[PDB]
């Protein structure tokens, strides 16, 4: 799996692949690796599909109880803290989770919290998660800028996931992109790697070692 999320002047760009695998057998190529907690909060699942999907769906219900009780949205810090505490209380029980809690709040701005099985919770501007995280980092750290335009940030996320999909066996499928804006999150669609790769090779001229 490859997932990345980076803050920039226009908000947050969240990109993830689609492939899910069980050994060598590729189980599916259309796994939705973003759980949509609320119109302003976005989970990014990696590792174990069952654990992430179930516990972030439950986090959605906790968020709903939060608005109903307090009439204001759960902060990104609060949701990430709930998830971190929950995952921590099952440490050693076998949970397999890597989660970036991306959201936007009036009193927080754009914010990303990295959460994983071992209980860690990190606030940060750039995160890559999954088996392909290093390949995504190689591109993000070499191309990331705070003042990227929205189109350039979307393309950077798409390209960073494409690199990991190319180089990592467990990170193929298709690229799903989300843009967490001041007024919510925008789903910028699904891009199949089998076409994105050739489009990017032609336009950039990169992947010069790949025959074609």
């Amino acid at each position: 799996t490859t997932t990345l999320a980076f803050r920039f002047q226009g908000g947050i760009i969240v990109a993830v692949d689609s492939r899910a695998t069980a050994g060598n057998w590729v189980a599916s190529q259309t796994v939705k690796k973003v759980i949509e907690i609320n119109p302003f909060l976005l989970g990014t699942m990696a590792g174990g599909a069952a654990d992430c999907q179930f516990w972030e769906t439950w986090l959605g219900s906790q968020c709903r109880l939060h608005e109903l009780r307090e009439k204001e949205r759960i902060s990104v810090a609060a949701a990430s803290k709930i998830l971190s505490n929950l995952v921590y209380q099952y440490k050693g029980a076998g949970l397999s989770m890597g989660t970036m809690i991306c959201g936007y709040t009036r009193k927080e701005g754009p914010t990303i919290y990295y959460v994983d099985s071992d209980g860690t919770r990190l606030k940060g501007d750039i995160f890559c998660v999954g088996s392909g995280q290093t390949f995504a980092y190689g591109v993000l750290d070499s191309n990331y800028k705070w003042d990227l335009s929205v189109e350039d940030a979307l393309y950077l996320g798409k390209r960073s996931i494409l690199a990991a999909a190319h180089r990592d066996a467990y990170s193929g499928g298709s690229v799903n992109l989300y843009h967490v804006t001041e007024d919510g999150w925008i789903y910028h669609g699904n891009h199949d790697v089998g076409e994105l790769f050739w489009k990017v090779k032609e336009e950039e001229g990169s992947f010069n070692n790949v025959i074609g």
């Binding site: 071992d118 860690t120 890559c128």
Partner: protein, 195 residues
């Protein structure tokens, strides 16, 4: 792996901790602060397992703040360190031990003396003039033994800390991405921009 160092100076306690956060093959962050302000004049730095460090740090901070709120005075660094030790020692025989080593540097406003306590994950408290946890002590202790004095001012303490940190950079294999240095003294807690 983490670096956490402490030097008790005539007037202040100088705590230094590494900025890197490593998870598996990749460094996730290079600006992490491995410390929590237990009280206005008490500061704690922690090292150990990923979730355990922060979870224990926040649990201890909440308990110390609850005690201070209830009794309406700041707990002495001795009391804070004893509570932390009792929580650590009480955990190793429980189902979920905290694999967390902590250095508690505080200024006792009642005794008007700086205090540095080293507490390992087993719950071994010891008051020290200079402290280090894990492998960070294997390089720094000899240098600290050589150069340390009781009567130093905070600036000589920072020079000694520079010596220790650059020795760690030289000989030690891991890249800990520098340290973040905080001084605990009569006036409270502050951070040094570039010691």
């Amino acid at each position: 792996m983490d670096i956490i160092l402490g030097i008790r100076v005539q007037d202040s306690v100088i705590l230094a901790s590494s900025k890197a956060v490593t998870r598996g093959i990749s460094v996730l962050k290079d600006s992490d602060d491995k410390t929590r302000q237990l009280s206005p004049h008490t500061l704690m730095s922690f090292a150990g397992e990923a979730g355990d460090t922060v979870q224990f740090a926040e649990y201890i901070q909440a308990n110390i703040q609850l005690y201070s709120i209830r009794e309406d005075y700041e707990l002495s660094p001795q009391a804070v360190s004893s509570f932390v030790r009792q929580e650590l020692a009480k955990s190793i025989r429980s189902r979920r031990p905290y694999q967390v080593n902590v250095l508690i540097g505080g200024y006792d406003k009642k005794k008007n003396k700086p205090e540095l306590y080293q507490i390992d994950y087993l719950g071994t408290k010891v008051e020290l003039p200079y402290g280090a946890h894990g492998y960070s002590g294997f390089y720094t202790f000899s240098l600290l033994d050589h150069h340390y004095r009781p009567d130093m001012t905070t600036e000589e303490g920072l020079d000694l800390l520079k010596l220790c940190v650059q020795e760690l950079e030289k000989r030690m294999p891991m890249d800990f991405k520098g340290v973040i240095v905080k001084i605990v003294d009569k006036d409270g807690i502050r951070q040094v921009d570039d010691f």
